[PDB]
């Protein structure tokens, strides 16, 4: 069970606590319809993470990239952190724009269930996705780096509309 | 104990199995002293991972970067994977040149031990570092992506010379 726990702490230490302090400055640079101030992280509990989000939903299209963030990390000179800006559609209309991406460790949970050596049952994929979201929420609720700049979007599919799911959180702000 | 196990599986799923198939073609492009054909991964058991490798050792200097590897990953368009080429010195002489980097999850192990919320004891970071190397070694031995293109350098330091440690693995090949 500690797998999803460590991945959530990994996700915060080696990513969120590094890019969240510099995000609002990157969004301001791109603006100068404006882009929302927060980073919206998609958390599909089925751990189904497509690499191309524009084709995953017709009402979600890639718009542009943010200016890249670079830094020396673990002996890698100028390791690049890049983020994408997406437009959310509603009845053929641009309803909102924001920085949108999936939580990558959910891909790791999915692949571990496929591998036999990983000791990770296929049935345990849902509860680890749940534990990943609970641990990540606990971290961000007490995170100094998280100051109204990060919004988690967790959902479960059984019709469901992903673009309508993101627009709900976007309008709440 | 399952924390380091999941970080090692993450390290292979979301990184090693993505860049190792492309590494030899990237090293050849740079060559056209030649650079070695394997990715050399430093595994300090004390989990002390500096971000600037050149500062850590006077006999290890940064030389150049490889051509960047990009790809759409989890909704992030053109996510960048970059690797650095280092030169290793011995008595004021260039003794070797290779692609060298630390295993970043060891930084995650170090940071979890300092956070109280992580449920990770200070004393347990050497134990988790040993499990991370053991799990990663088991994966790469059975990894089809790893075909004698990856070399792990685990070491425990109480004098110790890191550049001398890397050269030993280089000269075996
Ligand atoms: N540019 C980015 N775009 C979107 N997400 C990012 C980015 N950077 C970090 N993250 C998240 O942060 C997590 C932990 O990052 P990390 O601590 O660096 O350790 C990585 C992990 O243990 C394992 C799997 O990778 P994942 O991507 O699945 O997990 C990371 C992302 O979830 O391979 C490690 N690894 C990956 C690549 C690299 O270049 N060197 C490196 O060492």
Curated annotation (Swiss-Prot), chains A, B:
Binding-site list for 3',3'-c-di-GMP: 10, 15, 79-82, 104
Cytoplasmic topological intervals: 2-173
Mutation effect (residue 114 to A): Abolished translocation from the endoplasmic reticulum in response to cGAMP-binding. Reduced phosphorylation by TBK1
Protein name as it appears in the record: Stimulator of interferon genes protein
Residues given in the record as 2',3'-cGAMP binding sites: 10, 15, 79, 104
Impact reported for residue 81 to S: Strong decrease in c-di-GMP-binding
Family statement drawn from the similarity comment of this UniProt entry: Belongs to the STING family.
Crosslink site: Glycyl lysine isopeptide (Lys-Gly) (interchain with G-Cter in ubiquitin): 77
Annotated segments matching region Cyclic dinucleotide-binding domain (CBD): 2-173
Additional note from the record: The cGAS-STING signaling pathway drives sterile inflammation leading to type I interferon immunopathology in severe COVID-19 disease caused by SARS-CoV-2 virus infection. Tissue damages in the lung and skin lesions are caused by activation of the cGAS-STING signaling leading to aberrant inflammation. Endothelial cell damage is also caused by activation of the cGAS-STING pathway: SARS-CoV-2 infection triggers mitochondrial DNA release into the cytosol.
Associated clinical condition: STING-associated vasculopathy, infantile-onset: An autoinflammatory disease characterized by early-onset systemic inflammation and cutaneous vasculopathy, resulting in severe skin lesions. Violaceous, scaling lesions of fingers, toes, nose, cheeks and ears progress to acral necrosis in most of the patients. Some patients have severe interstitial lung disease.
UniProt function note: Facilitator of innate immune signaling that acts as a sensor of cytosolic DNA from bacteria and viruses and promotes the production of type I interferon (IFN-alpha and IFN-beta). Innate immune response is triggered in response to non-CpG double-stranded DNA from viruses and bacteria delivered to the cytoplasm. Acts by binding cyclic dinucleotides: recognizes and binds cyclic di-GMP (c-di-GMP), a second messenger produced by bacteria, cyclic UMP-AMP (2',3'-cUAMP), and cyclic GMP-AMP (cGAMP), a messenger produced by CGAS in response to DNA virus in the cytosol. (Microbial infection) Antiviral activity is antagonized by oncoproteins, such as papillomavirus (HPV) protein E7 and adenovirus early E1A protein. Such oncoproteins prevent the ability to sense cytosolic DNA.
Domain notes: In absence of cGAMP, the transmembrane and cytoplasmic regions interact to form an integrated, domain-swapped dimeric assembly. In absence of cyclic nucleotide (c-di-GMP or cGAMP), the protein is autoinhibited by an intramolecular interaction between the cyclic dinucleotide-binding domain (CBD) and the C-terminal tail (CTT). Following cGAMP-binding, the cyclic dinucleotide-binding domain (CBD) is closed, leading to a 180 degrees rotation of the CBD domain relative to the transmembrane domain.
Subunit structure: Homotetramer; in presence of cyclic nucleotide (c-di-GMP or cGAMP), forms tetramers and higher-order oligomers through side-by-side packing. Interacts (when phosphorylated) with IRF3; following activation and phosphorylation on the pLxIS motif by TBK1, recruits IRF3. Interacts with RIGI, MAVS and SSR2. Interacts with RNF5 and TRIM56. Interacts with TBK1; when homodimer, leading to subsequent production of IFN-beta. (Microbial infection) Interacts with human papillomavirus (HPV) protein E7.
Binding residues for 2',3'-cUAMP: 15, 79, 104
Annotated phenotype, changing residue 125 to S: Found in a 9-month-old patient who died following a fever and severe neck abscess without indication of any severe bacterial infection; likely pathogenic; may affect splicing; constitutively active mutant that promotes the production of type I interferon in absence of cyclic dinucleotide ligand; localizes to the perinuclear region in absence of cyclic dinucleotide ligand
Organism of origin: Homo sapiens (Human)
Tissue: Ubiquitously expressed. Expressed in skin endothelial cells, alveolar type 2 pneumocytes, bronchial epithelium and alveolar macrophages.
Result, substituting residue 71 to I: Renders the enzyme sensitive to 5,6-dimethylxanthenone 4-acetic acid (DMXAA) drug, leading to activation of the STING1 pathway
Outcome recorded upon mutating residue 108 to A: Strong decrease in c-di-GMP-binding
């Amino acid at each position: 069970s500690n797998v999803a726990h460590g991945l959530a702490w990994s996700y915060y230490i080696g990513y969120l606590r590094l890019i969240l302090p510099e995000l609002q400055a990157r969004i301001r640079t791109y603006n100068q319809g404006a882009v929302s101030q927060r980073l919206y992280i998609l958390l599909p509990l089925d751990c189904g993470v497509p690499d191309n989000l524009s084709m995953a939903d017709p009402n979600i299209r890639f718009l542009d990239k943010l200016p890249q963030q670079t830094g020396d990390r673990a002996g890698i000179k100028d390791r690049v952190y890049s983020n994408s800006i997406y437009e959310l559609l509603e009845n053929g209309q641009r309803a909102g724009t924001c920085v949108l991406e999936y939580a990558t460790p959910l891909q790791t949970l999915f692949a571990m269930s496929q591998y036999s050596q990983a000791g990770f049952s296929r049935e345990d994929r849902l509860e680890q996705a749940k534990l990943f979201c609970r641990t990540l929420e606990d971290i961000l609720a007490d995170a100094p780096e998280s100051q109204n700049n990060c919004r988690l979007i967790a959902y479960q599919e059984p019709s469901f509309s992903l673009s309508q799911e993101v627009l709900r959180h976007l309008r709440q702000e």
